[PDB]
Each structure stands twice: as structure tokens, then as C-alpha cells.
Design a protein around this ligand. Structure first.
Ligand SMILES: Nc1ncnc2c1ncn2[C@@H]1O[C@@H](COP(=O)(O)OP(=O)(O)OP(O)(O)=S)[C@H](O)[C@H]1O
Ligand SMILES: Nc1ncnc2c1ncn2[C@@H]1O[C@@H](COP(=O)(O)OP(=O)(O)OP(O)(O)=S)[C@H](O)[C@H]1O
Ligand SMILES: Nc1ncnc2c1ncn2[C@@H]1O[C@@H](COP(=O)(O)OP(=O)(O)OP(O)(O)=S)[C@H](O)[C@H]1O
Ligand SMILES: Nc1ncnc2c1ncn2[C@H]1O[C@@H](COP(=O)(O)OP(=O)(O)OP(O)(O)=S)[C@H](O)[C@H]1O
Lengths: 578, 346, 232
């Protein structure tokens, strides 16, 4: 044991072991197991990061402090390092020469207990073109005979996939389940441990900072378990604060520092509003109104949802908002969403629903079951939302997807999560979900038969209700019905498209101007209520872009100047220049 | 069991008290080994159970019958008069949308202090997804991943298992539950057995919703709750239905309940605002107004949240973001009579 | 480590590595992680061609150039090979002996950081017969105890399939996202890297040429990330 194990009582005496707080029941059972007649070997099994190791070392600490029932008094717990145990065993018999020597020392002592951390790794020592006769085979006869006592440690997964496969070995250990602690329990663990962190970092934590770390970590960090996730927030806040006195910002760790640290760890903002990002939100609606004309209520619904989430008055666990945009073609449904993601500076995740045309295509979004060919691919949707947790999610033409693919969104909209084929959860609490559709349009565009004309204005809603199941609709934030574009809007749209053309030309070094009448003429010529703005793009292409392309390609406009377009009155034809 | 009971007794006279080993000590030891509930007739748990029904009635308003079905199954089993080999209870909840079906289960696990395991059945459409729950056969790629359901029930043997929208899983998935509901077990791909005898199983469904919210043709309208029962019967095979302890049809919410629901939602808002340092007071008249504005018998309670979001949360968001209410708000909301509009500001 | 690792400060001193431009928040987040009491082991995760090594080596460069704080100054970062570490480990016991020797030398240095570039491979090095007793199983306790400090690096398609599954190992690293730079940022690193391309090819670049390379690559090349698509 001289270079194979560590005396944990010795470490407790010199301060190498952090103290245990609580866990009386988990420790009491271990003591009872160790006092059995045979197979008196507890095994600590649980999720990682819950104190499995802390308890085993914690016992050595309590023995040193004398805080034990006096059956444990004077026991010594030794920690075994497998890595040094096998390091020199090159020759046949060396592994059996060391392993037996250690066992004899333990058996002879009788007060000692051996602690084997990560016990699933003692299922191999020999491998010399032979088989069996390894560390497990050499230990079994002492365990069932009551000659030695050992303490094990393993996670549930390792214990279900590896350790338990050897039933004879498994029956020689007594499994104890260590569960993750409660909120109050976690706060108390931190309060008793903080003097170690304060000393290391030369910081002091406030009482509120400790509670905030525990409660925030629970709400935002879903990858780990308590207390370890809360401890990390505290330790990182400490490490961070210690790099502030460098600019002489000596301070304590307050709630505000905890909130900043959690926001960074989880990749989500919280106390970053105090910044003039407020300005970005304040005039978000205006920037979007300069890009999409009309359709103002749609713009407001989006900006209202964002501000509430930022203000803090959000949904406990739902997407920022969930909206269905519906209406006639070419009126900006797609445009409003696209410009929003640009205005906010965040990623747009685009999915085109006509791809999810058939029922089984849903596995494309979430991944194949275990045992299937695409298993290692993951899902396309759950992966996108993990890579970018703050985003705008756009599902175009959700009226073309499988009538059953809607059932995936159903659980997302209400709970904020989706689970992939490996059990990972995508978290949608920070995304904006926008779905677009033409579902109610065909029905309002009808000619009635009779002497008195009828009002068809309620038919759009009558058709949407027949497509989207009530359990789906009842969880949307809204349905925004978009209008047809008016002629006032067309004038604004025409100006918009001309500017885009001017930019394309500036790039080549030439410059276009259009007289106001020439613009009025184009606007009138291309108006069609039935198809929104798409025809205006076509009219401009035909009237301004074609002539220019030929002047630019066959000389004339090639490396030229001023092209002035004006309308004559006699033919209503356009002029051109250089 | 005999040896542990012995060791336990050996460690008694450390507190001076010496013992022999009686049946009671054997029962305590087995319950600990097996990870199950001991004599709860003298433990604080007796009071926890005694008033379990009230803690839940203060969170879910109305639907008393659902709460009673759940709490009697728990007390009964805990009392010792349980099933020999079945889950604590197996319930199917059904009803109109926007109710507390999924809210009557979540709060139960909280009230009892136990783990909620949730599965979304809408993610098990294709029939081959069954392996996702129980594991791939030997020889396949996911063999070593284990089972999501089979694996969850092992880590947590005492729990509430909730299967949402069970009317959306591929029908073959239901044939797994037939084994569990009757025998208490399920075998995974390593031959290990799940043991559901300490699990409460709740399944929720929307079968029949479209029908119950339909208007019939005629002078007199009908109660369509019967149609939903007719629909459930066509989805779930008789061998499944005949293994349930109950099917509970949830009701619609009345206006008396809405007043309670609105008060509930306002409190949740008040808590969020307290976090920001701003208290909020709302007049009873304003509350009565919000309740009448939002109530819709057909959509359940969800719309009430929408009403609060537009009438109280939006105005406040501007007061908080482009406002001097930082670390100090104290806003007041009251209703006028002239426009029935609400007041605001410090 | 004498025949297993590379002293990256030594490379920085001879111009063995390219300079790092920008990425201040990526250099400030990693430093804080390294200062923690326990598990002070940052892991850089990102898309291919994001610039993860520019960060890892850029740190060794800054130490050599003196552009660090009063906690990083005079510290050595060593880059580890796995190939030479395992090469020749015939006879059971050689792998563990060699690996433990490396770890002890690092433990007793106390002023060094180990850098593992393909961090999605130290999950096996053990006996063919098993079980375990590999590079991960032999390192976990020192990472846990705060005795050694390491820096890892991996892609999103390598940390989601081969690194997000060993829960105890993953728990000991702090994940830092390295994201793609934008156009202005790319132009600036090109200007910073440019002198070496100019020297290598005996050319000089027009400032407009640099901007055009970045903007045209964004417009026309679809399978790569910036500014790696511009550098080519
Ligand atoms: N009751 C407790 N008192 C003090 N610290 C605790 C307690 N319970 C857990 N811990 C923390 O647990 C330590 C982290 O390692 P552990 O969780 O003990 O080991 P583990 O459970 O075996 O997880 P592994 O090593 O990743 S599998 C933290 O440093 C301790 O603060
Ligand atoms: N109200 C508007 N204001 C400014 N531009 C508009 C407006 N409506 C449409 N456009 C133009 O039409 C855009 C093409 O996409 P969208 O209009 O968003 O398509 P859509 O409205 O979503 O309808 P679909 O998807 O074709 S049915 C052009 O990019 C816009 O310039
Ligand atoms: N800010 C920067 N300053 C200097 N060089 C940079 C900077 N950002 C990225 N680089 C990269 O300098 C060279 C090295 O890139 P890398 O950091 O190795 O990319 P990488 O992400 O590590 O590649 P992998 O991990 O194999 S996917 C490339 O030409 C640039 O991408
Ligand atoms: N009767 C009630 N008493 C108190 N709170 C309720 C009640 N009904 C619903 N809630 C609240 O519980 C929230 C979650 O939805 P549920 O009520 O559980 O509806 P559901 O049971 O899940 O059925 P679905 O999915 O809407 S069809 C609702 O949004 C809240 O209004």
C-alpha cells in the first residue's frame, strides 16, 4: 500500500478534505452496511456531481473529527489508485504479486477500509494473451468471506452497463442510492463551504448572492445536478471578482454578479438591459415599419412579445411568443420575420415546411430511434436550437407539412422543450416562433350567387379553424391576419425597389434617377391587388433593368454616369441618359 | 435481510438501548433495501396525506372529482391496502381543452415531494419508435444507450409518470402499457425489469375534443360528452380500457371558477414584479372586468392568461424599460366607468 | 513530457505560430475559468473553421509577448501528442506507467497548462481487453482535485456525439463557445495575418483586394466559415 493508496485520515487532518454538510441518512446506512457479518461493502451509486465522492471522503473527515458512532473510531480509510497499481506489472505474476500484497496488509490491519473510486474500472488487470484472473477474480473470495471491507463508487450508467454484468461481483456489494439535494439543502451546503472559496479568491459573498446562485442555476442550467451546478456559479463569480482588484475594483460578490455569471454560463441575457440596448428595443418598431409598409399590427405583436420577455414579465417556460401569420400572397409575411432577425442581431433558423410533406419525415426533425441507420445524425431541429439558444425560428408554409407534424410543435409551444433521440432536450424558452400560411385566403376570394351580395370576411377564420386542431390553436399567442396591399403602399414599395436598383448600380459605378412622374407611372402600371408586391418587382425589372443591362453590357452605360429616367406624355415612354 | 437487521440492532446500544429483532425491524430493513414507504401511520407523512386534497384544491379549481380519485388511490396504497402487482393507480384523464388535466398531475408530484417523469407521446408517432422507450435489440447501434422510460423508472422507483397526449402515439405503443398496467413490469433490451408498483400512472388525452365543441343541427343542442366517450372507445382497444382504474371526464370552467383563476394569475404577476422591486395592486372592479372580458367557456383557462398579458403586462413593460420605475414602482390599477379603462402609474 | 509535448512558449519565441487578432472576450472567459478553485479546465467548442486554435495558441503567444495579466505571466502551455504518447506501449503496464509519469511531472510543475487539441479522443488508450483504465479514467481525479489544468478543444459534431456522453468527464470541463467572426472582424484579422502571406509568396496585397476577398467569399462560397473561407 506504500505507493498505491492514500490515507484519507491523514488528509482530513491536514485539511485536504472539504467537510460534509448534512447527508446523515446516507452516511448512517453506510455505517450499518460496514457492520454486517458478510459482504459488508457499501457501493455508492448515483448521478454524477451529487457528492458520492464527497461522502466517502467525508467519512474519513468525520472519523478524524471524532464525529462517529464508536465502532468507527480508529478506522482508517485508504483510497486506492489503480493507475499506480498496474504501472509496473510487465511480467507474468507481477500484478498478482502486488495485488495480493495489498490485500494481506488490509486483512491483517482489520480496522482499515479500502475505498475504490470509479469501481467499474476494476474489471481488468491481466490481459497477457490469456483471460480471466484479473483484479475482480482475485477480490471476490475476500469479500464474500468477510475478511476485508471496501467502499465502492459508480454512476448509474456505469453501474447498469458495466459493473452489474458480473453478477457474482455485484452480489458482494450493497448498493446505496444518493440523490440530488433540495433547494434549502443546497443553500446550506454552500453556506458551510463558502469559507473555502472566500479564502481562495479573497472575496466575500453576500447572503443574497448565495441564494441567487442556487435558485438561478436551477432555473437556467439544466445540464448538471445540485449542488455542483450552484457551486460552480459561486466559484466562477469568485474567480471573476478576483480579476477586478487588478483595476482596483475590490469588492464583495453581490447578487448582480451572480446574475451576470449565470447569464454567461447559460448563454442567455438577464441584467444586460441596463445598457442602451434599451434604445434598440425602444425604436425596434420604427425600423421595421420603414421596411415593411402597412401590416403594422403584425409588427407590433412581435415587438410587444420581445419587450415583455426583456422587461422580465415573460412566460415561466414557453417560447418568447408563438405566432401564426396568415393572409394573401406577396404581402410581407416572410418579410416581417426576416427583417426582425436582422433588426435584433440574432440568427434566423429557417425551415421550409413543404419538405415535411409526408408523415414519416418527422424523424428528420428529431432523429431516428436507436437501432436505426440515421441514429448518429441527430435531429435537424433539435440540433439547431442547441447550437443557437437565442434565435428566431421560422417555419414557412406550415400549411404544406404532414397533418401530423404539427404535433411536434404542440409540446414545444406549451412546455418549451423537445427531446431528441438520445434524450437531450432542446430548450426553446429563448426563441421566437413564427409560422406562416395561406390557409384562409382561397375562401374569401369568392363570387357569390344571388341578387344581394354577401360578406365573406369571416371565412378566413372559418378555414383556419378547420385546419389547425383546437389543442394547437389554443396555445398560440396570436393569429395575425395580413391585408392586401393598398395603392398607397405600392407607391412606397416602388420607391423601395428603386432604391435597391440604385444600390446595384452604385456598385458598378453608375447612377440612376427617376423623375417623380416616371415613378408614379410605374406604380400605376404594375398594380394588381391580387398579388401584392411581387408584380412590382417584375415591372421594374422589365422597364428599368432591361434597358440598363444592355447599355452596361454593350457599352453606353459601361463605366458611365447619370441616367435619367423621365416619362414623356405622348407615348408614356421612358427617357434614358449617361 | 436477517443480517442487516442484526447489524442494525447491534448499532442500537450506542444510544444505550438494546434490542432483539422483531418483525417490525425486518419490515423496516426490507423497505429500505427495496427503496419503498415504511410505516407512515406515525410519520409526518400522515398529515401530509390527511390534507393532500386541500393543497391541490387550492391550485386547481373545480374538477374535485379528479383530485379525489388521485388522493384516494395514494392513501389506499400507502395504507397497505394496495394491489399485489399493479401501479398505484392508472388513470386516463379526458375533457375539453385548456383545463388542468396536465396541471392536476404536475401539482400532485409537487405536493407529495416526488419526481415527475414526463414523456410526450406526440414524439412516438412511428411504430418503430418503441425501441426508443425500451432499447435496441442486441446487435444494433443503440444497444448500449438503454431505455428512456425503462431507465427512468429504475432511477426513480417512487414517482408520478405522466404520458401526455397519449392519443397521438402510434397505436402499437399502447401495447407496451398493457403489460405494465396489469403486471407492474416491463422488460428492457438487457432483460432487466422495470417495476412500476410504486408509480402513479396518469395519461392524458384529447380524444373527442373536436366533437364536444361542435354545434349540432336542430332547435335543441346536445351534451356531446357522450360523443367523446364514443371516440375513446374506438381508439383504445377493450383489453386496454378494461385495465384502467378510471377514466375521468373533466368539466368546463364556470364563471365562478374564472374569478378564482384570474386571482391566481394576478398573483403570479405580482410575484414577477416583486422580483423587479415593483408592487402591484389591482382593484376588485378591475378584476371583475378582466374576468368578464376574457371568459370563454369553450377554450378553458388559457385565454385568461392572454387577457392579463394584454391588459397588465404590456403597459408595465414600457413602464419598466423606458420608464423611471427601476428599483421602485408601486403602480395602481383601477377601473373607470366611462370607458371601462384601467388606470396605471406609481 | 520531454518527448511527448511541445512547449508552445518556445514556439511563440521563434515565430512558430501565427498572431491572434481580436477575440478579447474569448481570451477573458478562458482566463477566468483557469482561475477557479476546482475544475478550472476550459474547453473550446465550435464549428469548423471558427478559429479555436487561434485562441489556444494565441494565448501562448500573448504570454510570450507579455500581453497577459499578473496570473498568466511566466506560465507554460504545453501541447500534447497522443500518437507519440501511445506509440510503443507494448506490454501491459507501459501505457499507465508512461501516462502517470506525464501527469506527475505536470502536477509537480504547478505553473503549467496542458493543451489537448483533439480533445475528442482521450476516451480510450487502455487494454484492448478492457476495461477502461485509459487516459480518461487515469486523469479524472486530478482534474477534479484542481491539481492540473488542461485546455481542450473540439467540434460541435464531436462534442455532441463523443464528448456529451461521459457524464463524469464532461462535468469537469467548462464549455466556451467560439463563434464565427463577421466581415469587419475578418478583414481585420486578414490585415494582421497578411504580412506572412505577403512574405511567403513575395507579393503585397491591395487593401481593396482584402476587402473583396472577404465579401466575395461570403457571397459565393457556401460550405465554410469565416474568416477561414477568406484566408484561402
Ligand atoms: N453534503 C455535502 N457537503 C459538502 N459538499 C458536498 C456535499 N454534497 C456534495 N458536495 C459537493 O460534491 C463535490 C463534487 O464532486 P462529487 O459530487 O462529490 O463526486 P461525484 O459525486 O462522485 O461526482 P463525479 O466525480 O463527477 S462521478 C463538490 O466539491 C462538493 O461541494
Ligand atoms: N408590405 C410590404 N412592404 C414592403 N415590401 C413588401 C411588402 N409586401 C411585400 N413586399 C415585397 O415582397 C417580398 C417577397 O416576400 P413576401 O412578401 O414576404 O412573401 P409572402 O408575403 O410571405 O407571401 P408568400 O410566402 O409568397 S405566399 C419582397 O421581398 C418585398 O419587397
Ligand atoms: N482572430 C484571429 N486572428 C488570427 N487568426 C485567426 C483568428 N480567427 C481565426 N483565425 C485562424 O488562423 C488560422 C487557424 O485557424 P483555427 O483556429 O485553427 O481554426 P480551428 O477552429 O481551430 O480549426 P479546427 O479546430 O481544426 S475545426 C486560420 O487561417 C484562421 O481561421
Ligand atoms: N381549473 C383550473 N384551476 C386552476 N388553474 C388552471 C385550471 N385550468 C387550467 N389552469 C392553469 O393550468 C395551465 C396549463 O394547461 P392545462 O390547464 O393543464 O390544460 P391541459 O390540461 O394541459 O389540456 P390542454 O393541453 O390545454 S388540451 C393553464 O394554462 C392554467 O390556466
Amino acid at each position: 500500500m506504500e505507493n498505491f493508496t492514500t490515507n484519507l485520515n491523514q488528509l482530513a487532518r491536514v485539511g485536504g478534505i472539504d467537510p460534509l454538510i448534512g447527508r446523515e441518512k446516507e452516511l448512517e446506512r453506510a455505517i450499518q452496511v460496514l457492520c454486517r457479518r458478510r459482504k459488508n461493502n457499501p457501493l455508492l451509486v448515483g448521478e454524477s456531481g451529487v457528492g458520492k465522492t464527497a461522502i466517502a471522503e467525508g467519512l474519513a473527515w468525520r472519523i478524524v473529527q471524532g464525529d462517529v458512532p464508536e465502532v468507527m473510531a480508529d478506522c482508517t480509510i485508504y483510497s486506492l489508485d489503480i493507475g499506480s497499481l498496474l504501472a509496473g506489472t510487465k511480467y507474468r505474476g507481477d500484478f498478482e504479486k502486488r495485488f495480493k500484497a495489498l490485500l494481506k496488509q488490509l486483512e491483517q490491519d482489520t480496522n482499515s477500509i479500502l475505498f475504490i473510486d470509479e469501481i467499474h474500472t476494476i474489471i481488468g488487470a491481466g490481459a497477457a494473451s490469456g483471460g480471466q484472473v484479473d483484479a475482480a477474480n482475485l477480490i471476490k473470495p475476500l469479500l464474500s468471506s468477510g475478511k476485508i471491507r471496501v467502499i465502492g463508487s459508480t454512476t448509474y450508467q456505469e453501474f447498469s452497463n458495466i459493473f452489474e454484468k458480473d453478477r457474482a461481483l455485484a452480489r458482494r456489494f450493497q448498493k446505496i442510492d444518493i440523490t440530488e439535494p433540495s433547494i434549502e439543502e443546497t443553500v446550506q451546503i454552500i453556506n458551510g463551504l463558502k469559507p473555502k472559496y472566500e479564502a481562495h479568491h479573497d472575496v466575500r459573498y453576500t447572503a443574497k448572492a448565495v441564494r441567487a446562485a442556487v435558485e438561478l442555476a436551477v432555473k437556467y442550467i439544466n445540464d448538471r445536478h445540485l449542488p455542483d451546478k450552484a457551486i460552480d456559479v459561486i466559484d466562477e463569480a469568485g474567480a471573476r471578482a478576483r480579476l477586478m482588484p487588478v483595476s482596483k475594483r475590490k469588492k464583495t460578490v453581490n447578487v448582480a454578479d451572480i446574475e451576470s455569471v449565470v447569464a454567461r454560463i447559460a448563454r442567455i441575457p438577464e441584467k444586460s438591459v441596463s445598457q442602451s440596448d434599451r434604445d434598440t428595443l425602444k425604436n425596434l418598431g420604427d425600423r421595421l415599419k420603414m421596411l415593411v409598409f402597412g401590416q403594422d399590427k403584425a409588427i407590433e405583436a412581435l415587438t410587444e412579445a420581445i419587450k415583455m420577455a426583456r422587461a422580465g414579465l415573460g412566460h415561466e417556460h414557453k417560447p418568447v411568443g408563438s405566432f401564426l401569420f396568415a393572409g394573401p400572397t406577396g404581402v410581407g409575411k416572410t418579410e416581417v420575420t426576416v427583417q426582425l432577425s436582422k433588426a435584433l442581431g440574432i440568427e434566423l433558423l429557417r425551415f421550409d415546411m413543404s419538405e415535411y410533406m409526408e408523415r414519416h419525415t418527422v424523424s428528420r426533425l428529431i432523429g431516428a430511434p436507436p437501432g436505426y441507420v440515421g441514429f448518429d445524425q441527430g435531429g435537424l431541429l433539435t440540433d439547431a436550437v442547441i447550437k443557437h439558444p437565442h434565435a428566431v425560428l421560422l417555419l414557412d408554409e406550415i400549411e404544406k407539412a404532414h397533418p401530423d407534424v404539427f404535433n411536434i410543435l404542440l409540446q414545444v409551444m406549451d412546455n418549451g422543450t423537445l427531446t431528441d433521440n438520445n434524450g437531450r432536450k432542446a430548450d426553446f424558452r429563448n426563441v421566437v416562433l413564427v409560422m406562416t400560411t395561406n390557409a384562409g385566403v382561397r375562401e374569401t376570394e369568392r363570387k357569390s350567387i344571388g341578387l344581394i351580395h354577401q360578406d365573406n370576411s369571416t371565412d378566413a377564420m372559418e378555414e383556419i379553424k378547420k385546419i389547425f386542431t383546437p389543442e394547437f390553436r389554443n396555445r398560440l399567442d396570436n393569429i395575425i391576419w395580413f391585408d392586401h396591399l393598398s395603392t398607397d403602399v405600392i407607391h412606397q414599395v416602388v420607391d423601395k425597389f428603386i432604391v435597391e436598383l440604385q444600390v446595384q448600380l452604385d456598385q458598378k459605378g453608375v447612377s440612376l434617377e427617376v423623375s417623380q412622374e416616371a415613378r408614379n407611372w410605374l406604380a400605376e402600371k404594375g398594380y394588381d391587388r391580387a398579388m401584392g408586391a411581387r408584380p412590382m418587382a417584375r415591372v421594374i425589372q422589365d422597364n428599368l433593368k432591361k434597358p440598363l443591362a444592355n447599355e452596361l453590357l454593350f457599352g453606353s452605360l459601361v463605366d458611365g454616369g447619370q441616367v435619367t429616367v423621365a416619362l414623356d406624355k405622348e407615348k408614356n415612354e421612358l427617357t434614358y441618359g449617361f
